[PDB]
């Protein structure tokens, strides 16, 4: 990515948008896994109690 002349800014904006979407997707995957593990927390304790 270069910001030297008045032609690369448009390509820069496109690449930045695509990178932002990629980061958002990876964060979403992390959140999904953490929520699944949080749900699987409690059944183990209930089984231990029984």
């Amino acid at each position: 990515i270069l910001m030297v002349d008045q032609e690369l800014a448009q390509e820069s904006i496109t690449k930045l948008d695509k990178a932002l979407e990629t980061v958002s997707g990876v964060r979403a995957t992390i959140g999904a896994q953490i929520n699944r593990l949080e749900y699987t927390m409690t059944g183990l304790d209930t089984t231990r109690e029984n």
Partner: protein, 50 residues
């Protein structure tokens, strides 16, 4: 006397078997409750979209 002794012993054994049975159903209902808890969150995030 012999018949009464035998009946007493059998009744005691049945009394033990009863609680032996009840524990298993308690475990089963715990597991079912966990599954039912998950299903409603699925339905909520289902009605989210549309």
């Amino acid at each position: 006397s012999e018949k009464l002794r035998g009946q007493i012993s059998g009744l005691k054994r049945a009394s033990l078997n009863a609680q032996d049975g009840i524990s298993l159903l308690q475990t089963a209902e715990g597991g079912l409750q966990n599954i039912q808890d998950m299903l409603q969150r699925m339905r909520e995030l289902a009605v989210q979209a549309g």
